[PDB]
């Protein structure tokens, strides 16, 4: 059935509660049988499921949402396969002790319009491995895709030994309905994502929470490095799904000695600079009411240039600007979710690093940071960058997110998402969620 208004939301939350208490007595041997026939049926339906999120939403390319739906559905069935989280964990018998486990309860959820399908396959293959449930609450612009993918996983789980109504989803939502699925008494988690619009209200609700955020991560180029290579990698990892992948590049800090050779090189391959009157036209589009617009998020390169008024060739990839001020006021440091960028000028190496600490803490959270240089003639400079920045990843001569297929990049790096926090204040690092946060453990003693 459909769930429209609050008068029956208190009926959906009661059915699952009748089932979770039937789930929390299974044994370890017939829960690792659901986890198999629920991952395969998400990977074997990777290409009716991306093509249906492009026609409604209006952004994204069909060719890149197919090699991202397959990476977040087999990394999560290659590491959490044999990790005991049911019944008994360990047993030391010098005097008699054991360490049984139990689950929490009912896990709420929130989903944005950017990746409407990848971050729903990931929250329904750990909430189905640690003996609990979930409830979704999607965005209006993509209400048809998210509800779809949380049905394929269900109807394939029913027919292997599961109960009936373990997962549910709102349809036809709004704001006024969502605030009742965070103060209801019988749910005790929230996994929120998106920009800094909803994650900030989640932490302040009288309940525990974690959040999968994104902060503007910088790029640093010094003099000793190669130029013919570290301009054509940044240019690849930004036109990947038109620059909506979490933890992409947003700013390019560069020293002065080679600033007049890492400018025209952009203009030849795929770039188109701007330094005049056009700079104020683009500067009045990505900032409308003190927040980000929803008119360009995901769109290609040349179309936003049409919103301002001027024209650009068709085969362009990115729009580069250039400024020198770095705080709130100038709108190029806020994350944008668009194929744009911003390049700064700096004197020497030791001052560039000083011009990146101030960008990270603006966004609230640290996710990544990357540095291009030589790694066999400066062992003392790659280690000085590991005692001054504050994130969880530090990349050296490597793009931020990942490549496509047609290459041999490093394989055992976790995805950009599935990486959250516990606060918003300042100087807070992230860490990777998984089946150890949803498991409280006990002890008995004879």
């Amino acid at each position: 059935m459909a769930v429209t208004n609050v008068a029956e939301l208190n009926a959906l939350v009661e059915r699952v509660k009748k089932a979770q208490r039937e789930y929390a007595s299974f044994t370890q041997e017939q829960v690792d049988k659901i986890f198999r026939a629920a991952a395969l049926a998400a990977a074997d339906a990777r290409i009716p499921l991306a093509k249906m999120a492009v026609a409604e939403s209006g952004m994204g390319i069909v060719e890149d949402k197919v090699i991202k739906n397959h990476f977040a559905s087999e990394y999560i069935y290659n590491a959490y396969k044999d990790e005991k989280t049911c019944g008994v964990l360990s047993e030391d018998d010098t005097f008699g002790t054991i360490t049984i486990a139990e689950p929490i309860g009912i896990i709420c959820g929130i989903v944005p319009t950017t990746n409407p399908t990848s971050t729903a396959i990931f929250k329904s293959l750990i909430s189905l491995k640690t003996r609990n449930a979930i409830i979704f609450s999607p965005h209006p612009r993509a209400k048809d895709a998210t509800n779809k993918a949380a049905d394929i996983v269900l109807q394939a789980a029913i027919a292997a030994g599961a109960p009936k109504d373990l997962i549910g989803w709102i349809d036809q939502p709004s704001v006024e309905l969502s605030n009742a699925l965070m103060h209801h008494p019988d749910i005790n988690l929230i996994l929120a994502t998106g920009g800094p619009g909803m994650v900030k209200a989640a932490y302040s609700s009288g309940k525990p929470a974690i959040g999968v955020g994104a902060g503007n991560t910088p790029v640093v180029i010094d003099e000793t490095a190669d130029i013919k290579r570290a301009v054509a990698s940044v240019l690849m990892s930004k036109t990947f799904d038109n620059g909506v992948i979490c933890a992409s590049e947003q700013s390019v800090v560069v020293v002065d000695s080679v600033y007049d050779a890492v400018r025209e090189r952009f203009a030849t391959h795929g770039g188109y600079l701007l330094q005049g009157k056009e700079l104020k036209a683009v500067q009045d589009v990505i900032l409308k009411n003190g927040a980000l617009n929803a008119a360009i998020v995901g769109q290609p390169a040349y179309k936003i240039a049409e919103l301002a008024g001027f024209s650009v060739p068709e085969n362009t990839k990115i729009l580069i600007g250039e400024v020198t001020v770095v705080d709130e006021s100038e709108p190029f440091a806020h994350e944008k979710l668009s194929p744009t960028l911003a390049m700064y000028r700096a004197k020497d190496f030791e001052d560039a690093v000083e011009k990146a600490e101030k960008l990270v803490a603006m966004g609230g959270i640290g996710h990544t940071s990357c540095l291009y240089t030589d790694q066999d003639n400066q062992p003392a400079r790659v280690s000085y960058f590991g005692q001054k920045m504050k994130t969880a990843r530090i990349l050296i001569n490597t793009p931020a997110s990942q490549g496509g297929i047609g290459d041999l990049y490093n394989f055992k790096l976790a995805p950009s998402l599935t990486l959250g926090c516990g606060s918003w204040g300042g100087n807070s690092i992230s860490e990777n969620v998984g089946p150890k946060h949803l498991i409280n453990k006990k002890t008995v003693a004879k």
Partner: peptide, 27 residues
């Protein structure tokens, strides 16, 4: 994995639709 140029779908039904009538692909 091979095939150096990263293909795209809109240019992979033009090959199947020009080697059926007998024409030759060209840009």
């Amino acid at each position: 994995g091979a095939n150096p140029r990263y293909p795209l779908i809109s240019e992979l039904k033009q090959i199947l639709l020009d080697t059926y009538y007998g024409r030759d692909y060209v840009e």
